[PDB]
């Protein structure tokens, strides 16, 4: 699904689909941490 996700202006979660390490320079930007999305995904319900 992705390691970062952005907020679409209509309100949907646009997951990036890339495996990247987080840095705190991305804290000011539009990307979020994907573990804290609280969005259930099929098959990975234990990580959620």
């Amino acid at each position: 699904r992705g390691a970062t996700y952005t907020i679409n202006a209509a309100g949907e979660f646009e997951f990036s689909g890339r495996n990247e390490k987080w840095d705190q320079s991305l804290y000011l930007s539009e990307h979020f941490p994907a573990l804290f999305s609280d969005v259930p995904l099929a098959g990975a319900n234990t990580i959620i």
Partner: protein
């Protein structure tokens, strides 16, 4: 099973031509001078794709040493200290595969 364990000795490399040696017009003893570099450069990756090969080798070797252990009903403690060591080679391989 014997063929399956011999699929763990396979190399994890690529086949690079001698691009800087042919253009330098150096002596070579073949038609296409190609050497075998053991592992690809791994820039920008979170999970290292060469260290993850050793994850899947030990996961097969921890099933070979488990079936050999329970065939001779050895201790739970003497088997657990083997598999703790087999994943201590997991951790020490991640430090150097970078």
């Amino acid at each position: 099973t014997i063929i399956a364990i011999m699929r763990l000795f396979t190399p994890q490399g690529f086949l690079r031509t001698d691009d800087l040696a042919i253009a330098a017009n150096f002596p070579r003893a073949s038609r296409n001078p190609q050497t075998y570099i053991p592992y690809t450069n791994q820039r920008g990756t979170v999970t290292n794709e060469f260290a993850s090969r050793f994850r899947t080798i030990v996961a097969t070797l921890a099933n070979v040493v488990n079936e050999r252990a329970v065939q001779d009903d050895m201790q739970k403690a003497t088997r657990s200290c083997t598999k703790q060591w087999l994943r201590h080679l997991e951790t020490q391989f991640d430090n150097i595969a970078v």
